[model samples]
Target: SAPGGKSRRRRTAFTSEQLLELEKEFHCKKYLSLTERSQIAHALKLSEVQVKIWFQNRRAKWKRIKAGNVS
Candidate 1:
């Protein structure tokens, strides 16, 4: 109801703050464990599973960059 959209493909998504957390941790370590994972969820009031998948997506992303984007 705020910004706007049209394409219509995937589903709901996380907010900017959530990404801020993910970005830092991902940069520090390619992997994350549930111990802190759940803590993060608590702090962010985020659904653990959604957070899990986001990490997965990011891992695959950095892996590709390491392989060499070259552009």
Candidate 2:
């Protein structure tokens, strides 16, 4: 086994400004069309895949919170 092996993959961290912009958009729409996703990704300087995954994760989180409130 390798000791103290450091991963080469870059860690992703969202800034407050980025989160605010994303949250504002999410409030308007949970899902975005491909073009819209591309546009947002461009504006946020992120990959389209990253934008898509963010929405996917955000929706799941909201769903869980909503479901929890009912129980």
Candidate 3:
């Protein structure tokens, strides 16, 4: 193997139906109670941590949209 070879992490790619539900929930709330988080996790077949991290990351993306419009 080459010392300079590139490497990558395998990420969980959520399904389109999952994304549809996630986007709907995210649009309504930036944060969630554990009950809601667990509900979404089970509903989407994702871990609670993944759902938590998605909201954590996507909140920034949503803010960018607002920032772009504000500018």
**How many clashes does each candidate structure show, in the order listed?**
0, 0, 0
Worst 10 residues of 3 by lDDT: 1-10
Considering summed lDDT, which 10 consecutive residues are worst modelled in model 2? Answer: 2-11
- RMSD (CA, Å), candidate 1 to true, equals 6.8
**Model 3: which residue pairs collide?**
none
Alpha-carbon runs more than 4 Å astray in model 3: 1-12, 64-71
Which candidate, 2 or 3, has the higher lDDT? 3
Whole-model Cα lDDT of every candidate shown, in order: 0.69, 0.72, 0.75
Candidate 2 positional error at 9, Å: 20
TM-score of each: 0.67, 0.68, 0.67
Ranking by TM-score: 2, 3, 1
- Candidate 2: Cα lDDT at 42: 82
- Model 2, residue pairs in steric clash: none
Task: At residue 31, give the lDDT of candidate 1.
Answer: 69
Please write out the lDDT profile of model 1 over residues 1-71, one tens digit for every residue.
Answer: 34322333334465566657777777787667878788888876777787788788767766667876776
